[PDB]
Amino acid sequence: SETKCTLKSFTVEKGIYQTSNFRVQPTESIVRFPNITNLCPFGEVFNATRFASVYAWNRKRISNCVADYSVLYNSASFSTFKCYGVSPTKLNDLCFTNVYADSFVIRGDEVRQIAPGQTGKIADYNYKLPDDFTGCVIAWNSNNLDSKVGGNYNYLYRLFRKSNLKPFERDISTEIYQAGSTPCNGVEGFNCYFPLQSYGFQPTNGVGYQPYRVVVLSFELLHAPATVCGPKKSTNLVKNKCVNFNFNGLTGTGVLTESNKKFLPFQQFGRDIADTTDAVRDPQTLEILDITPCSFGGVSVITPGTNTSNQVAVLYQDVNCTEVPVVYSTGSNVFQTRAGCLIGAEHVNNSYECDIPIGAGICASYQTSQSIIAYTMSLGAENSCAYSNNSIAIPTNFTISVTTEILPVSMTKTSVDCT
Amino acid sequence: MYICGDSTECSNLLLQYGSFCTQLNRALTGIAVEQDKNTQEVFAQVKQIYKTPPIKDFGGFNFSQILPDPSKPSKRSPIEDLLFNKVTLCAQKFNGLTVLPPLLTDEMIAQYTSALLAGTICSGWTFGAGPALQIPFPMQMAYRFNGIGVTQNVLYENQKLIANQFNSAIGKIQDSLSSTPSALGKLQDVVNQNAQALNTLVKQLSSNFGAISSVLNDILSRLDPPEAEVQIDRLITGRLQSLQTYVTQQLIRAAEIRASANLAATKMSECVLGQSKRVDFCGKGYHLMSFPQSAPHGVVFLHVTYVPAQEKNFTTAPAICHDGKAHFPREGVFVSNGTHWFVTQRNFYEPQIITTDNTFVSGNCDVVIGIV
Amino acid sequence: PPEAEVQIDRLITGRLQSLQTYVTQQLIRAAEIRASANLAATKMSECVL
Amino acid sequence: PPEAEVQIDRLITGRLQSLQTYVTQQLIRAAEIRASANLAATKMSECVL
Amino acid sequence: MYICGDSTECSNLLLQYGSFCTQLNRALTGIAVEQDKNTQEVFAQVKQI
Amino acid sequence: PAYTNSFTRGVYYPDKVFRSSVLHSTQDLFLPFFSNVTWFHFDNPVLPFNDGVYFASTEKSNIIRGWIFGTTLDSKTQSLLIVNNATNVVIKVCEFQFCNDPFLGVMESEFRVYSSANNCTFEYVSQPFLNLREFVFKNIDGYFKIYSKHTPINLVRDLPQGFSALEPLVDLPIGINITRFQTLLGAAAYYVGYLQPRTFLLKYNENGTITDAVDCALDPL
């Protein structure tokens, strides 16, 4: 029936057909992880008397600690929690290598300037976000701690600047900017003024200038030995079974075995000629594992034609016979050939002429109650030319035989209108 | 498997692109069937398996370097063994790149070639045009010499020399194949082209194609479905274009290989099973026979060619005006060493006295130009 | 129009790819058929007359 | 650049499609020309020689 | 040069497409070499001028 | 002064991947083949550190007690006082006022080096610097990566031909702005090379080990 559906017809002709692609399904899962238990001080950088000035933004590095971001989702009320390049829910699993927290304070209107490519005075010279940005942004109103009646003038910006700074650049120079024919010998007059002038910070200021604490969590992806691992388990290790794995950030399915090719002390994983992941190193107790893909192969169905009989056989392309866990309504008569694992065919020894080619010599057919048989194909008859010198053979009769030979000449002249 | 490795979020998107994977699978299946038909057409021409004669005393000729030798575990002639252990060239497998095995194993190809060879030695060429007729090998050599113009007496009177030359050439061809580095260039080039195509196809997997990452698992694990769908779409488009390019290149290369295989089958049928009078199509010089030899993914003929040698030039006249009548040669040229005249064959110097047996008269000698 | 243009563009790219694939397949098959026809013409010339 | 990337991608895809079409047509035409050259070589090796 | 005329940004964008068109360049070079071989095969049959 | 001619040097494993009998090509910073390495024999103060600098550290009695990175120094800008001791190897990063070297005799006298102290952001303890100890110091992507390889050939002049791959030891996750460095030593023998962006074809052995590499900028061959 699968062959009938693949052919899109109720009639199947004699021959070999391809129906689907057998593939061994995974059985277990692997969550291999190293030993890290200490928690990162995210709440520390989120609970400070003052965060930073917009030009004195902090770049606190976080490393070698388990960091759970589920608390940062439900047990918090940030107004802006956009996550660029990563999924906030799919964020408690990836084990990033370096994560930098850029801490500072901004206004309510200027909270939108923290974007990969956004313009504006804050987003041009005070802070630059690169295009390729896998990190997120954290921002919420804080009109309870930084709020000073006299104004938190310690926070200042840098409008007075000529060229936009390169991404992730910390500018410290507070010298007077040059904006014209000013001599800039101290001066602070004419067209030159203090780049860091002020921050009108009266508490009664509207939501467009209310304090907003911005912590940008920029984290590199999993292209190095993972250090900031997400919370999870660390399941044990299994071998010689097609299972899916989560080695650090590596994800895939394989039958990983004991590796033979030794690794250098600094190398983690390996690749073959076509840069395919071949071997890995255990985040747990150090052991090299030889990851190879599990068995798979396109199934083929051998039918003598629905007109002749409804008996069919199945040949799995490359599996080594035993891997037939689940079609497969019947069984028995299992015969392993160099081209696969024939099922439902009787392996006879009497060589005949090929009817349904299979591969590597074997060739099935429907020979008599009739059953499906498989055999080594026979090249021809056993005519013997009795060579002998001083002796010749001469005919005495002809036959005048007429043979039919067919050759195609032309196809159907078809034209297709593009528009 | 290639476009979307065991990912539902990618297969359910590939389902939108219509019946493309079916088209590519059909094309590759057709290519494989064509390869099988190519091998069958080239080698399975005569369907009677002739046993290899035990003896090797073929009147002087030595068929030891082309005939199969049973001492080795593999029933291959020394030249076939050299051809096998000169083309050396890995197994991709992995991500949905399977290689099907050929229908006719190398042992079956060797047996077919041995059957053709034993038919050539025993029956000459009648085994390819009916029932095999045994005939002594010197007689078959004479009847192949008669095809190119020279008479039988050239071979029999020089049987030892001809056998020595044949053995020397057969011995030299093995050394020529082994010493020369290029040698088997076509088969190695075919293998190299296929390997490069497959390697490039695998290499196309590790390319972002305008997405955020080159791995579908990473993309579908780091992003929510509504925004990961675009990246998966970009990757699917890139991989589909790569697969289409590979399939088209394979189709064109398979068409070229089919043309070459048709040419090889024509050569096998028109040279081994007979003797061709087409000039410089079946060797350099006049053709006598050929000996097929199996090679990995191809065939290697050993054409045997009669080629003239050291020549002596005489003076010639179109006809002879004897009694007013202009005798013309029957099957020869009129030559002379300066004093006496002779009539001899066109491709060998075998002078004969000009008798009425070797000439025919066609009227008076006042019309021909240059008659002597 | 602003979104219909995007949808139509996607459809146009898909249909263009499909038509190009069909045309390439037809070209290759026609080359094979031309080779067969040349063989047939040779056989007609050298076997019939 | 972050916006011009999209237009650059569209143009690159179009030009790549055009170049691939041209190369495939050239391959097929070169196969036909090679067949014609083989026929001519056979004619030169068989008729004049 | 064809896909991205003497532009660094467009060339960098094209670089993400892998070896898509190194294959095209190799195919055209093979076509040219085949044309040279074709002329040599047809005309240089005998080298005893 | 002495520029020599250099040889096949500066080849290091780019990443932590294991490639076996592969001819993989990598685009990274590398020391160009047959360059002109500078021999300084007391010339410590100048040492114009570029983006990545190769170091020879030829056959000596391990007098080199570390390196001083930074340009302004004077305890104003962040500096890297990476003083590898005889044991436990101090890695100190701080705004340090710099005057001279320890100059322990020609020993156990005065480990003065710097004068003042500041923020002192980072500190690391390990056991590197255990001879021709080459170095591929490279400060990119907020990472100061170090590489080394010991090959005690003990020949005349300098590095004759002997190819080797310099395995990594450690990185450094700080974003200091460095364009100058110091050599902390009688007469010495040390060479300094400069890194440039190139493309190599590092050939791997049966096990991962760079056996021979070529440069795709030197000559058409």
Ligand SMILES: *[C@@H]1O[C@H](CO)[C@@H](O[C@@H]2O[C@H](CO)[C@@H](O[C@@H]3O[C@H](CO)[C@@H](O)[C@H](O)[C@@H]3O)[C@H](O)[C@H]2NC(C)=O)[C@H](O)[C@H]1NC(C)=O
């Ligand atoms: C070989 O040459 C001979 C030359 O005669 C052919 O023999 C003839 O064959 C036909 C057909 O088999 C014979 O006809 C049959 O004869 C008997 C008696 O009637 C019977 O078996 C059938 O009813 C039929 O009529 C014919 O008699 C026979 N001629 C002689 C003189 O024996 C033969 O056909 C040639 N071989 C082939 C393969 O064509």
Ligand SMILES: *[C@@H]1O[C@H](CO)[C@@H](O[C@@H]2O[C@H](CO)[C@@H](O)[C@H](O)[C@H]2NC(C)=O)[C@H](O)[C@H]1NC(C)=O
């Ligand atoms: C070819 O047939 C001839 C027929 O004469 C065989 O020659 C005879 O060979 C035997 C065995 O060596 C000798 O005893 C006879 O004296 C030979 N006959 C003559 C007339 O000299 C010859 O052996 C056959 N060829 C082969 C290879 O067996």
Ligand SMILES: *[C@@H]1O[C@H](CO)[C@@H](O[C@@H]2O[C@H](CO)[C@@H](O)[C@H](O)[C@H]2NC(C)=O)[C@H](O)[C@H]1NC(C)=O
């Ligand atoms: C055919 O030629 C082969 C060599 O190609 C001959 O085999 C050699 O025979 C000599 C004696 O004649 C032996 O000393 C050599 O050891 C043989 N060589 C090998 C490689 O086995 C063979 O004898 C010839 N056959 C005939 C009938 O003359």
Ligand SMILES: *[C@@H]1O[C@H](CO)[C@@H](O[C@@H]2O[C@H](CO)[C@@H](O)[C@H](O)[C@H]2NC(C)=O)[C@H](O)[C@H]1NC(C)=O
């Ligand atoms: C040309 O050939 C003829 C025929 O062989 C030669 O004539 C013979 O010459 C020999 C001596 O050399 C005589 O004994 C024969 O009687 C001659 N034969 C006949 C049939 O007359 C002739 O000498 C040759 N000429 C040259 C210049 O070599």
Ligand SMILES: *[C@@H]1O[C@H](CO)[C@@H](O)[C@H](O)[C@H]1NC(C)=O
């Ligand atoms: C720590 O990880 C190492 C990795 O080699 C492993 O051998 C060891 O058992 C782990 N220790 C604990 C307490 O899990």
Ligand SMILES: *[C@@H]1O[C@H](CO)[C@@H](O)[C@H](O)[C@H]1NC(C)=O
């Ligand atoms: C197939 O499986 C059998 C039984 O486990 C085993 O003996 C045999 O070696 C396997 N063959 C291959 C080619 O893997």
Ligand SMILES: *[C@@H]1O[C@H](CO)[C@@H](O)[C@H](O)[C@H]1NC(C)=O
């Ligand atoms: C034979 O050929 C040579 C070389 O061309 C020539 O010199 C000579 O005259 C020719 N002999 C006769 C008899 O024509």
Ligand SMILES: *[C@@H]1O[C@H](CO)[C@@H](O)[C@H](O)[C@H]1NC(C)=O
């Ligand atoms: C560069 O190296 C060459 C070759 O060793 C040398 O002659 C030259 O003086 C060096 N310096 C410059 C500035 O070219």
Ligand SMILES: *[C@@H]1O[C@H](CO)[C@@H](O)[C@H](O)[C@H]1NC(C)=O
């Ligand atoms: C300096 O080296 C000494 C031993 O020579 C060691 O005791 C000390 O701890 C080192 N200083 C560091 C590692 O900062």
Ligand SMILES: *[C@@H]1O[C@H](CO)[C@@H](O)[C@H](O)[C@H]1NC(C)=O
């Ligand atoms: C030294 O650095 C500290 C730490 O920030 C700072 O308080 C102090 O002012 C610095 N001293 C000088 C002279 O810059």
Ligand SMILES: *[C@@H]1O[C@H](CO)[C@@H](O)[C@H](O)[C@H]1NC(C)=O
């Ligand atoms: C790089 O940092 C150093 C501090 O070591 C500083 O003196 C120098 O000016 C910086 N370079 C630039 C271009 O700002």
Ligand SMILES: *[C@@H]1O[C@H](CO)[C@@H](O)[C@H](O)[C@H]1NC(C)=O
């Ligand atoms: C490295 O490979 C070589 C062969 O190229 C082998 O002899 C040697 O043992 C290998 N080294 C290690 C440490 O396995």
